[PDB]
Structures are given as structure tokens and as C-alpha cells.
Amino acid sequence: GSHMNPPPPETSNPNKPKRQTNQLQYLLRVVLKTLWKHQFAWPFQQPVDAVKLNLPDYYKIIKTPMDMGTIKKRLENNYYWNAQECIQDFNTMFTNCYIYNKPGDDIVLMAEALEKLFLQKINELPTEE
Numbered sequence: 790g791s792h793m794n795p796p797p798p799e800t801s802n803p804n805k806p807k808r809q810t811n812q813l814q815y816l817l818r819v820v821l822k823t824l825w826k827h828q829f830a831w832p833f834q835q836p837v838d839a840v841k842l843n844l845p846d847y848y849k850i851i852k853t854p855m856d857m858g859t860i861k862k863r864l865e866n867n868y869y870w871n872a873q874e875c876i877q878d879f880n881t882m883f884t885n886c887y888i889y890n891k892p893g894d895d896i897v898l899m900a901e902a903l904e905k906l907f908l909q910k911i912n913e914l915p916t917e918e
């Protein structure tokens with residue numbers, strides 16, 4: 790892509806520790822599956838392309854970018870060590886949107902809908918076994 794967009798977040802790194810857990814399996818099979826097909830998911834399914842969107846300040850304001858495409862790849866490629874790392878990525882994604890954008894903007898309403906669903910699903914994150 791454009792040299793003015795940063796590299797996406799890491800999704801493969803032999804140096805980083807990782808494992809499967811039943812919680813991470815739930816995060817893929819239930820949480821990301823349910824969010825991905827939400828009617829408002831599409832803006833969040835890939836990194837923000839600040840060039841195409843004419844947001845030249847985006848990556849000056851958002852220094853820890855995250856999106857559900859990256860999360861999906863991290864889950865499918867078994868990048869994570871624990872559920873907390875993945876939950877953190879979701880929460881970064883939502884809060885980036887709320888930091889960059891005005892309350893009540895469409896993109897914020899979209900994020901808020903996804904976040905509502907996310908919290909309902911994480912309340913049922915299974916006991917680690």
C-alpha cells in the first residue's frame with residue numbers, strides 16, 4: 790500500500806510466545822465471528838487507510854492502531870498467549886475510534902454497537918480449562 794500508511798500491526802513473529810487456550814478459541818469462534826458479521830463491522834475489518842480517507846493526521850493521533858482484520862489474523866495464526874492480549878486489541882480498536890472521532894459521529898455509533906455486542910460476549914468468556 791501507500792508509503793504514508795504505517796505497516797500494519799504484527800500478525801506473525803517466531804520470537805513471540807503463543808499458545809492455544811479454550812478462551813482464545815472462544816474469542817475466534819464466538820466473539821470475532823459474531824462481530825465480523827455485524828452490519829456495522831465493515832469499517833473495522835482492515836486497518837484505517839488514512840491516505841484513501843484523507844485523514845493525514847490519523848497516525849499522528851492514533852499511535853497504537855488496531856482493527857478486526859488484524860485481530861482475525863492474530864487469532865487464526867495463533868499469535869496470542871492469552872485472552873487478555875486479544876481483549877486488549879479489541880479495546881484498543883474501540884478506544885482509538887472514540888479518541889479520533891466526535892461523540893455521535895457515525896463511525897462512533899458503529900463502534901459503540903460493536904462494543905456493546907463484544908461486552909455481552911466477553912461476559913460469557915469460558916473459565917480457562
Ligand SMILES: Brc1ccnc2ncccc12
Pocket residue numbers: 832833837842886889890896
Ligand atoms: Br473507516 C474508519 C475506521 C475507524 N476509524 C475511523 N475514523 C475516522 C474515519 C474513518 C474510520
Ligand SMILES: Brc1ccnc2ncccc12
Pocket residue numbers: 832842895896899
Ligand atoms: Br469509510 C468512512 C470514512 C469516513 N467516515 C466514515 N464513517 C462511518 C463509516 C465509514 C466511514
